[PDB]
Amino acid sequence: SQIRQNYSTEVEAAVNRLVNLYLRASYTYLSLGFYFDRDDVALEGVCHFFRQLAQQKMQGAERLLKMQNQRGGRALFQDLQKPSQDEWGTTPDAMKAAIVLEKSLNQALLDLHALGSAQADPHLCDFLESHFLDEEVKLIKKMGDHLTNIQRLVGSQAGLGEYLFERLTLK
Amino acid sequence: SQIRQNYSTEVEAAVNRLVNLYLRASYTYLSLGFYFDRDDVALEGVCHFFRQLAQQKMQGAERLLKMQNQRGGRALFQDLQKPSQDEWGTTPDAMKAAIVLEKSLNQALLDLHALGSAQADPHLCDFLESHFLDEEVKLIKKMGDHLTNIQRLVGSQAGLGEYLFERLTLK
Amino acid sequence: SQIRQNYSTEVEAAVNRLVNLYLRASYTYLSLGFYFDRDDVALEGVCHFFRQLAQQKMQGAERLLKMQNQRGGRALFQDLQKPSQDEWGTTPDAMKAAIVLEKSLNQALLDLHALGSAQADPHLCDFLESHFLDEEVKLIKKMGDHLTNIQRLVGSQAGLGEYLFERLTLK
Amino acid sequence: SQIRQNYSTEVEAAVNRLVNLYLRASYTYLSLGFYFDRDDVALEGVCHFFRQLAQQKMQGAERLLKMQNQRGGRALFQDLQKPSQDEWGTTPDAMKAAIVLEKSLNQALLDLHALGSAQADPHLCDFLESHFLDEEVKLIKKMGDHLTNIQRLVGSQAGLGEYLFERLTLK
Numbered sequence: 001s002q003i004r005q006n007y008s009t010e011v012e013a014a015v016n017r018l019v020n021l022y023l024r025a026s027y028t029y030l031s032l033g034f035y036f037d038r039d040d041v042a043l044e045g046v047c048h049f050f051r052q053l054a055q056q057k058m059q060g061a062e063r064l065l066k067m068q069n070q071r072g073g074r075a076l077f078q079d080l081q082k083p084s085q086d087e088w089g090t091t092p093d094a095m096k097a098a099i100v101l102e103k104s105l106n107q108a109l110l111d112l113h114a115l116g117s118a119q120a121d122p123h124l125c126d127f128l129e130s131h132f133l134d135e136e137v138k139l140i141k142k143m144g145d146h147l148t149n150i151q152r153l154v155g156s157q158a159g160l161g162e163y164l165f166e167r168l169t170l171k
Numbered sequence: 172s173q174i175r176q177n178y179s180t181e182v183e184a185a186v187n188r189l190v191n192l193y194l195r196a197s198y199t200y201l202s203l204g205f206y207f208d209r210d211d212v213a214l215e216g217v218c219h220f221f222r223q224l225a226q227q228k229m230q231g232a233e234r235l236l237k238m239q240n241q242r243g244g245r246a247l248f249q250d251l252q253k254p255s256q257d258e259w260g261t262t263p264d265a266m267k268a269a270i271v272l273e274k275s276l277n278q279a280l281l282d283l284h285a286l287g288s289a290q291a292d293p294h295l296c297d298f299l300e301s302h303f304l305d306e307e308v309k310l311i312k313k314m315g316d317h318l319t320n321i322q323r324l325v326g327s328q329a330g331l332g333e334y335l336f337e338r339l340t341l342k
Numbered sequence: 343s344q345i346r347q348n349y350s351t352e353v354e355a356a357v358n359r360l361v362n363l364y365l366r367a368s369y370t371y372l373s374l375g376f377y378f379d380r381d382d383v384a385l386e387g388v389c390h391f392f393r394q395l396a397q398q399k400m401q402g403a404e405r406l407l408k409m410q411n412q413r414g415g416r417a418l419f420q421d422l423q424k425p426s427q428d429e430w431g432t433t434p435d436a437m438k439a440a441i442v443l444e445k446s447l448n449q450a451l452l453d454l455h456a457l458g459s460a461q462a463d464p465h466l467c468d469f470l471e472s473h474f475l476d477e478e479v480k481l482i483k484k485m486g487d488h489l490t491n492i493q494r495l496v497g498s499q500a501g502l503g504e505y506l507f508e509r510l511t512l513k
Numbered sequence: 514s515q516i517r518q519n520y521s522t523e524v525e526a527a528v529n530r531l532v533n534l535y536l537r538a539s540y541t542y543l544s545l546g547f548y549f550d551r552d553d554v555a556l557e558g559v560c561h562f563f564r565q566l567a568q569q570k571m572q573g574a575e576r577l578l579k580m581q582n583q584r585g586g587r588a589l590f591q592d593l594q595k596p597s598q599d600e601w602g603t604t605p606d607a608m609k610a611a612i613v614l615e616k617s618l619n620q621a622l623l624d625l626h627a628l629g630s631a632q633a634d635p636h637l638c639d640f641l642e643s644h645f646l647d648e649e650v651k652l653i654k655k656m657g658d659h660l661t662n663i664q665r666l667v668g669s670q671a672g673l674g675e676y677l678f679e680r681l682t683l684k
Binding site: 172229240 | 343344345365369372373376377379380381382400404407408411414416417418419420421422423424425428
């Protein structure tokens with residue numbers, strides 16, 4: 001490559017794995033979104049929440065691919081495993097699942113940052129910090145808030161609590 | 172002092188004590204606000220309510236200090252005791268606590284007004300009346316209203332009532 | 343905590359100590375501001391300078407508390423020690439004091455950053471860099487500039503130099 | 514009088530004396546203003562300061578007369594003694610004189626308020642509080658600030674300090 005500089009093969013590979021992880025998260029959220037659009041589920045604010053997250057993860061993938069090219073590395077795609085469930089249960093089940101998913105993305109980010117720090121790759125480390133690590137922290141906090149509110153509502157009376165949460169918290 | 176006139180040492184001292192009381196109330200509300208921002212509490216309208224009150228009490232302190240200087244007295248600061256609790260319970264627990272706190276500030280105002288009246292200090296008495304006594308009455312009435320509504324809601328079903336109050340009453 | 347991830351107990355504790363330090367700095371600046379509002383001191387541009395800094399430090403505290411909650415840690419407040427002086431001397435005395443105070447806040451930031459780097463906490467490290475470390479550097483430079491100008495003016499003729507600095511440099 | 518109610522002859526008389534005091538203060542400020550307009554004094558910001566105060570005191574007189582009529586009392590005017598000096602010295606001399614004058618007006622206000630309180634005349638007491646007592650406190654604080662600044666400047670080098678104060682503090 002005419003441009004590649006201070007960009008290790010280990011980081012290149014790790015960035016390709018992370019792209020796969022973001023794409024797979026996007027796919028997961030797409031499934032979650034359309035489950036909540038089912039006529040027998042019918043929670044539009046929940047559908048919209050997860051569809052917006054599908055878009056966000058696809059944007060993260062695209063930003064990682066842009067950077068891979070900026071650095072002179074080469075994007076390599078792998079098969080995308082389908083989401084872990086076909087049906088996602090109640091709102092709290094789905095929010096727990098999303099938190100698990102985001103924590104796994106955050107751990108992959110942290111691992112990538114440790115690797116870049118080990119390879120002395122300050123551009124990679126700043127990239128991740130600027131665009132990814134704070135967005136994860138903020139989203140996980142928002143999801144944790146939502147879980148606490150859903151849990152508090154479905155303790156009381158489950159159907160009514162799910163409706164109220166979708167109507168009064170979700171867009 | 173070149174400006175001091177009809178301003179007793181007793182009032183000067185009492186005004187410094189009241190500044191400490193307002194600052195300590197501010198600190199209390201700051202704690203209350205951030206407890207309701209915890210991911211395992213997660214009541215944003217409650218957080219916002221108490222953060223606005225923290226700002227209001229700090230403003231009261233600053234107004235008392237401005238007056239102390241206008242009169243030729245001298246501000247003296249003391250240590251600020253931390254708030255009485257680390258965790259604030261449910262919304263009704265927190266609102267009861269705030270009412271207790273505001274009643275104690277109102278009693279300090281009333282005591283200061285009695286002292287100024289005993290010292291024949293009509294400026295002090297008008298100052299307190301204009302900026303402090305009516306604001307307290309109004310805030311305590313608002314808090315009492317909120318407690319009545321929260322209590323009526325958490326009698327029914329506690330988690331659901333707390334959510335509805337934060338969503339439909341609080342900003 | 344349902345959200346906590348890669349957030350050590352050491353950092354949590356250190357962040358709570360830093361909140362105390364920012365609050366105490368705020369309190370210090372509040373005292374400084376109101377001393378310069380005394381009728382026998384009467385330097386309005388100096389009062390305004392320190393009152394704006396009191397607000398800024400309170401904002402720093404609030405941002406640290408927001409982050410502590412975003413990460414799943416728990417805010418704990420301690421008593422706030424009163425400021426180190428009741429009377430702050432001349433403008434140069436007060437500016438020296440503020441520089442000492444800001445250097446101590448900057449060292450606490452640097453210490454916290456070293457701890458986060460030791461605990462491999464890149465979010466904490468980016469947080470501090472983005473919001474705190476550059477603001478400190480910039481403010482200390484501004485204070486150093488002010489001290490140099492005040493010192494150059496009060497070498498000449500002290501009362502006149504203090505007035506000119508407040509009128510022609512301070513807002 | 515068809516309207517007079519709870520308005521003692523003592524208060525009526527005291528209000529007429531206070532009108533005389535305000536008019537005489539106005540006259541004093543008029544003299545002060547025109548002394549600073551002399552070609553051999555020539556401090557325009559000082560002239561403007563005292564001319565604005567002459568207008569303010571005349572406004573206070575007119576407000577006291579409006580109230581005397583609102584209450585059913587009867588205005589009675591007495592001769593106005595000329596100001597205590599023909600020439601007013603330096604800026605600090607003149608500011609000291611104004612502070613002495615305002616303290617004497619404030620004491621007359623306080624005396625009138627004590628009398629109204631003794632006669633159980635709450636309208637009079639609120640009138641004085643609303644329109645007069647806080648305006649005095651604020652003006653005396655402003656004058657005290659000015660004296661401190663002038664004194665600090667004329668300690669250094671008297672002619673230069675007087676000029677700088679008129680240019681950089683006064684409108």
